[PDB]
Every structure is written in C-alpha cells, then in structure tokens.
Amino acid sequence: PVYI
Amino acid sequence: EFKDVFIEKQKGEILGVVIVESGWGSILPTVIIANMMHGGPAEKSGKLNIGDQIMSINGTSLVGLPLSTCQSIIKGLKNQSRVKLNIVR
C-alpha cells in the first residue's frame, strides 16, 4: 500500500 | 494521547509506514498508520506503532489535508536523518  | 515521535534514521530509508484517512471518531482530521515496514526505522525505533494518528511531521501540519497530501509530506522527506512527528497514540 505504498510505504512512506 | 499525543506524543512527539522521533525516528532517527538515514537517507534512502524513507521511514517504512502506511497512512490513511482518519475515519475514526475524528478527534483530529489526520492520517492513520494502517501499516508499517517491520524492519525499517519505524519498527526499529518503536515510538511509532500502528493505530496512531499523525498530526504534523517536522512542522508539516497534516490535521486538515487529505491522505494523498499527507503521503506527499512524508515521501518528500525520504532523505531525512531525524523524523520529528507529533502523533496521538
């Protein structure tokens, strides 16, 4: 889920 | 409860976390740590744990802006050595  | 998070890491290690729209009671219109990279500086530190609401990062106030906006805030500081966040456990 798109890691920041 | 509010808490000033401090994630000391190195560049090229973003942070390792996932945020989403705070659909909870909405105590503070911010994002929710829905996921975390179990291995990066996020898990290494410990100060950051899933189920927390992040308000502002290094001054960047998130309390009000959408999710996409917040994501941009963090992804922007992908080369930081110290992440000073103000979230509420």
Swiss-Prot record, chain B:
Tissue specificity statement from the Swiss-Prot or TrEMBL entry: Brain and spinal cord. Isoform 2 is expressed in testis and brain, but not detected in lung, liver or spleen.
Intracellular or extracellular location(s): Cytoplasm; Cytoplasm, Perinuclear region; Nucleus
Domain PDZ span(s) in chain numbering: 4-89
Its job: Putative function in synaptic vesicle exocytosis by binding to Munc18-1, an essential component of the synaptic vesicle exocytotic machinery. May modulate processing of the amyloid-beta precursor protein (APP) and hence formation of APP-beta. Component of the LIN-10-LIN-2-LIN-7 complex, which associates with the motor protein KIF17 to transport vesicles containing N-methyl-D-aspartate (NMDA) receptor subunit NR2B along microtubules.
Subunit structure: Part of a multimeric complex containing STXBP1 and STX1A. Interacts with STXBP1. Also part of the brain-specific heterotrimeric complex LIN-10/X11-alpha, LIN-2/CASK, and LIN7. Component of the brain-specific heterotrimeric complex (LIN-10-LIN-2-LIN-7 complex) composed of at least APBA1, CASK, and LIN7, which associates with the motor protein KIF17 to transport vesicles along microtubules. Within the complex, interacts (via PDZ domain) with the motor protein KIF17; the interaction is direct and is required for association of KIF17 with the cargo that is to be transported.
Comment, domains: Composed of an N-terminal domain that binds Munc18-1 and LIN-2/CASK, a middle phosphotyrosine-binding domain (PID/PTB) that mediates binding with the cytoplasmic domain of the amyloid-beta precursor protein, and two C-terminal PDZ domains thought to attach proteins to the plasma membrane. The autoinhibitory helix linker occludes the APP binding site.
Protein name: Amyloid-beta A4 precursor protein-binding family A member 1
Organism the protein comes from: Homo sapiens
Gene label: APBA1
Residues of the full protein shown: 655 to 741 of 837
